[PDB]
Amino acid sequence: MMKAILQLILEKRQEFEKLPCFEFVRDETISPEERLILYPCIAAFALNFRDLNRYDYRDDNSSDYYQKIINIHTQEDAKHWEWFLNDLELLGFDKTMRFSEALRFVWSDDLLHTRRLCHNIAVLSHDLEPVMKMVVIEAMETAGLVIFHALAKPGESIAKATRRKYLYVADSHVEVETGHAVGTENIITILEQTQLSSEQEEKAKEIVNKVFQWSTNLIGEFERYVKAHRSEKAQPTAA
Amino acid sequence: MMKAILQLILEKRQEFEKLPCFEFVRDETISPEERLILYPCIAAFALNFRDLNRYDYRDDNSSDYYQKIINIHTQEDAKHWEWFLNDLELLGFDKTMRFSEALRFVWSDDLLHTRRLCHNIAVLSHDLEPVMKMVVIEAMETAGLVIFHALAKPGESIAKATRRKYLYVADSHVEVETENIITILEQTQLSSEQEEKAKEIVNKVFQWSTNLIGEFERYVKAHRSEKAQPTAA
Numbered sequence: 001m002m003k004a005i006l007q008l009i010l011e012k013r014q015e016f017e018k019l020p021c022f023e024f025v026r027d028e029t030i031s032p033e034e035r036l037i038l039y040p041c042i043a044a045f046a047l048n049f050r051d052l053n054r055y056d057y058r059d060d061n062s063s064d065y066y067q068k069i070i071n072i073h074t075q076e077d078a079k080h081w082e083w084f085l086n087d088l089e090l091l092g093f094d095k096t097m098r099f100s101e102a103l104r105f106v107w108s109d110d111l112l113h114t115r116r117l118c119h120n121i122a123v124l125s126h127d128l129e130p131v132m133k134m135v136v137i138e139a140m141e142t143a144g145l146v147i148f149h150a151l152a153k154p155g156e157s158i159a160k161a162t163r164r165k166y167l168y169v170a171d172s173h174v175e176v177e178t179g180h181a182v183g184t185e186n187i188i189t190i191l192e193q194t195q196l197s198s199e200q201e202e203k204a205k206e207i208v209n210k211v212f213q214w215s216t217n218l219i220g221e222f223e224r225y226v227k228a229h230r231s232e233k234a235q236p237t238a239a
Numbered sequence: 240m241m242k243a244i245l246q247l248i249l250e251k252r253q254e255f256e257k258l259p260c261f262e263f264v265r266d267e268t269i270s271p272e273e274r275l276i277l278y279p280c281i282a283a284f285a286l287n288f289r290d291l292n293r294y295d296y297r298d299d300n301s302s303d304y305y306q307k308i309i310n311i312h313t314q315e316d317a318k319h320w321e322w323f324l325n326d327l328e329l330l331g332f333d334k335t336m337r338f339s340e341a342l343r344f345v346w347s348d349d350l351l352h353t354r355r356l357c358h359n360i361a362v363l364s365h366d367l368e369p370v371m372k373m374v375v376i377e378a379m380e381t382a383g384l385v386i387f388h389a390l391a392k393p394g395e396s397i398a399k400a401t402r403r404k405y406l407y408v409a410d411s412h413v414e415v416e417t418e419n420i421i422t423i424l425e426q427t428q429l430s431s432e433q434e435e436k437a438k439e440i441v442n443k444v445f446q447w448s449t450n451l452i453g454e455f456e457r458y459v460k461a462h463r464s465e466k467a468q469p470t471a472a
């Protein structure tokens with residue numbers, strides 16, 4: 001039942017939206033610089049997410065049409081890592097450090113789940129047919145939209161106050177994620193018309209469970225990082 | 240029993256040993272500082288190799304005996320990333336930079352195969368039985384031993400000249416690499432399907448290692464002046 005899979009995604013989304021980290025990020029009584037304290041944590045993810053789209057999801061030598069739809073989808077998501085680096089500099093988090101200090105930060109044990117999220121997604125997606133890969137992408141995009149709907153609230157506050165163009169923790173990022181390329185069909189529209197077998201349904205349920213459990217593990221690391229570095233607020237500069 | 244697989248590993252090793260990068264690293268007529276120009280490239284691998292042993296290979300919740308032998312083997316290999324960071328500082332490569340520059344370096348397109356080698360190994364090993372995981376580990380350890388037999392030649396030269404204790408590009412690292420996995424493979428009978436999969440494993444591991452070494456060669460050519468800068472005691 002693909003109707004049950006897409007509703008399972010909504011059920012997982014509704015539970016995921018209630019995590020304490022998002023209540024903190026959406027709280028406008030706290031300065032947006034303190035709500036974006038978790039921003040450096042995304043460095044263990046953002047470029048690994050670029051590689052996930054470049055090299056794991058994508059298969060340019062494929063003739064299958066559903067794979068080509070996945071390929072078109074990766075072309076958009078593989079651009080967002082430069083947006084992350086754009087806002088990293090604007091937030092005053094692109095700090096100078098020793099090369100090994102940058103390595104120890106990315107591979108910190110406190111960012112374990114953040115760093116291996118795309119890795120675990122790639123392992124889960126490797127032996128899947130294209131329509132089952134779409135379930136992974138749809139669940140992953142659903143969790144990501146919950147995150148960036150929240151992060152865009154302090155990001156757009158800093159962007160208007162400092163008069164700087166933010167690209168990652170911004171509404172334009174959310175709107176691009178919500179939409180899709182002109183001329184291509186929606187992955188969700190393809191899923192709504194797809195009939196799954198009993199074996200596919202069991203694998204699809206496992207996919208949704210794992211994607212949101214791993215996203216929840218990541219968000220837990222964001223919370224603990226904010227608690228452990230509560231003074232390391234963002235330091236943007238006005239234009 | 241599995242003699243063809245262990246011989247295939249030996250054939251791939253002998254072919255792998257002849258790559259031009261290793262001839263460059265073993266040439267003592269070139270200063271060891273110039274032969275270790277490729278050392279920063281390992282930043283895209285060494286810590287990913289730590290995670291590979293910690294989280295992909297290792298399975299502490301397993302009762303299988305072959306998996307426990309893998310778990311013990313990962314406890315040694317998961318320590319070597321700190322050795323890499325040690326020799327990184329000694330060689331004068333632990334330089335100061337912006338956070339994004341370090342990110343752009345690791346995820347450089349010129350280090351693609353270096354960066355995703357452990358990732359591709361993990362993807363290959365995930366659905367394998369423990370004895371088949373051992374085939375992956377054995378081929379990977381054989382290629383790594385060819386790498387560090389070579390790098391230890393200029394590394395020990397700098398270690399002797401500067402009287403500093405190197406840990407990664409050093410003989411002590413090679414000696415640790417050299418309950419055995421190899422003994423289990425010799426006593427294991429594979430099915431026809433298992434043997435065919437083991438051939439695929441060996442081909443992929445050494446092909447991916449060859450791509451990594453190819454990136455090391457192009458990096459040395461592109462940064463021929465950025466020789467190591469170690470200091471004497």
Ligand SMILES: N[C@@H](Cc1c[nH]c2c(Br)cc(Br)cc12)C(=O)O
Nearest residue numbers: 042045046049080140143144215
């Ligand atoms: N829109 C995100 C993609 C994304 C998708 N899912 C995500 C999760 Br779960 C956590 C984080 Br942090 C990021 C994502 C990006 O462009 O990097």
Ligand SMILES: N[C@@H](Cc1c[nH]c2c(Br)cc(Br)cc12)C(=O)O
Nearest residue numbers: 281284285288319379382383448
């Ligand atoms: N002895 C290496 C492990 C290793 C095993 N295989 C390797 C290959 Br192929 C390339 C490189 Br660079 C390193 C390895 C280490 O501890 O980092």
Ligand SMILES: [Fe+3]
Nearest residue numbers: 077080173177
């Ligand atoms: Fe995005």
Ligand SMILES: [Fe+3]
Nearest residue numbers: 316319412416
């Ligand atoms: Fe090692």
Ligand SMILES: [Fe+3]
Nearest residue numbers: 316380415416
């Ligand atoms: Fe080893």
